[model samples]
Target: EEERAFLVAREELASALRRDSGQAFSLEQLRPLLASSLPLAARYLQLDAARLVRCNAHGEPRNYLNTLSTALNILEKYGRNLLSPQRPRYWRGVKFNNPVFRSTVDAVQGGRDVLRLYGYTEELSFPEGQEEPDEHQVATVTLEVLLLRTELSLLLQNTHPRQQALEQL
Candidate 1:
């Protein structure tokens, strides 16, 4: 039972990587997408996170989780930096965020489209751009994703044949 679940989850993540998507997402959408599962992915490295549908990688915990998490850290910051949020429904709710050095968020937005939270205009970064993202960081995430896909491919191919033979007996 557990093996089947593992296979399913790994495939989901592998497929997502194959597509190479995730250009943009609504703020509310992104929170949970990379939210709950990341910490678990960090286990392989104890300080990182990973991506994919499967909650855990059974083949070799060694650096799979660590690689995946580092990839996510790059991805999360890249996408998050794009955010330029506005105030929520109730103006009063804004109280939670410390203003620090700025005034109403609307002013900070200036004139660009915003995501869920707030930001520093100086901090925005686009992975594809030559600016803040830096090509190496983008490459790190890209390379890591490929690593995940390759690992999953090996498992699906090797495991299915071996399992089928075992069951036939």
Candidate 2:
């Protein structure tokens, strides 16, 4: 029953992410999903980490990592549209009044950190452990690092025009 629930959750998340409507997703929508998913992903990572030495139970952890990776990629794509100057209403130049934008950015950072911490823990296990780290987990960590950097650069690019101009002078 528990496994069934997880499979359902993964499918739901995957279906949501498989979308490409070319529409700008509102912070209202994005914030809640990130808020919920990140913490859930963290829990799955913790579960996997706890069993790192046991060298068993691969499917559950792998599924969650895949979800986390897909979510990050979707977030990155959304960030591009949301941060683009072409969409001035969505791009508020970083100092967001609603707090949604700032919160989402911070949540993404935390998500990346979660993945990084997982990788570090896996590294500590090292060759001494019977089990090697999952390929998906390692790749997810690397991708999260790159994805966070992409989001940060996007935020910087959308900095207030006056701030950009001042920097030039």
Candidate 3:
């Protein structure tokens, strides 16, 4: 059942989010972990975007928007961790060279496309830091994500419930 599938997917993601990276693993293990994790988060968002849009059109409760924010936060955290320049022995130079990086790119591109579909075309700026390519890439992706969330939130907030009924009234 689709409902059961959604539950299972959420359960899997929650378990991943709840996991303590400090607890275990050959550091190399993190690459694959991150590889799968980042994409899962992205795909989940892509999957839910349609539902969220529909819910907004239908003027559903704000709870789904909150959930989207939470998921976006989690995604941002994972992305930063994946791109952080800490721990050379374990993570150096892996930022733009790994599958995780590709996943990051994919997520960002997908997010941007969705935003454009919803008529969001403003150029978003990120604060400059070291200006490392990895940092900029992740920052751009993160900004797009936050923008997507805000756009969805505003859409839901502006839509009135039972518009059809109101029309009939």
Candidate 4:
């Protein structure tokens, strides 16, 4: 019963995620599995974005640029620290030893993941008999991208210092 084994494996992973704290083994083993398994619980993050790209069985003429909206939003917020209400400050102004550098590294990992996927599929399909696109592979990679970005966004938000000026009502 291959299905039974697979289910056991998934259950084990869930328990691990539940009890896992900060440890090297958990980071290494769990990171990849965590990335892979996210689509199961967080389908919207992956499937919504995955549906945008149309990839043939072959990679490249590469499906690209579903929206400039998100790209510009990331740039604007980071470049200007839109989360803050005072005079806008660039993220670069933040100290490297501080949490800001940590978030850049986080987002960069996501950026690198997407780039690796791009290289795997650097171009579109050929003019020959290209049948149905392999949505499975594309969906997997798309899921990676989604997880990476979500990680970065969450890290930034979690690490952000709350506005000292906010008068809590």
- Candidate number with greatest TM-score: 3
Q: In candidate 2, how many clashes are counted?
A: 0
Task: Show where candidate 1 strays beyond 4 Å.
Answer: 1-51, 55-132, 159-169
**Superposition TM-score, candidate 3 onto the true structure:** 0.31
For model 4, residues 1-169, the per-residue Cα lDDT tens digits are: 4444434544454343223311112334434433333333343323233332222112322112312223323332332221223434332133335453344422322332332232223232222343322323333443334333343333334421221211120
TM per model?
0.25, 0.26, 0.31, 0.27
List model 1 lDDT by residue over 1-169, tens digit each.
Answer: 4444433443444344334434332324222222222323431221122324233343453444443334344334433232213322332122314352123222221111221111213333222332332232332333333333333333344532233322221
Which regions of candidate 2 fall more than 4 Å away from where they truly are?
1-118, 122-127, 159-169
Worst 10 residues of 2 by lDDT: 48-57
C-alpha-based local distance difference test score of model 4: 0.31
On the 0 to 100 scale, the lDDT of residue 10 in model 1 is 36
Decreasing lDDT order of the candidates: 3, 2, 1, 4
lDDT of 3 by residue, 117-137 (tens): 222233422224423334434
lDDT of 2 by residue, 1-169 (tens): 4545544443443334334223333334333222332322342433222222122223453343343334455444433333233433522223324354344433332433333333324332223342433433433333333333332233345432233322221
- Candidate order by TM-score, decreasing, is 3, 4, 2, 1
Estimate the lDDT of model 1: 0.31
lDDT of each: 0.31, 0.35, 0.38, 0.31
RMSD of each: 16.3, 18.7, 15.6, 19.4
Q: At residue 128, what lDDT does model 2 achieve?
A: 34
* Native-to-model Cα distance after best TM-score fit, residue 107 in candidate 2, in Å: 20
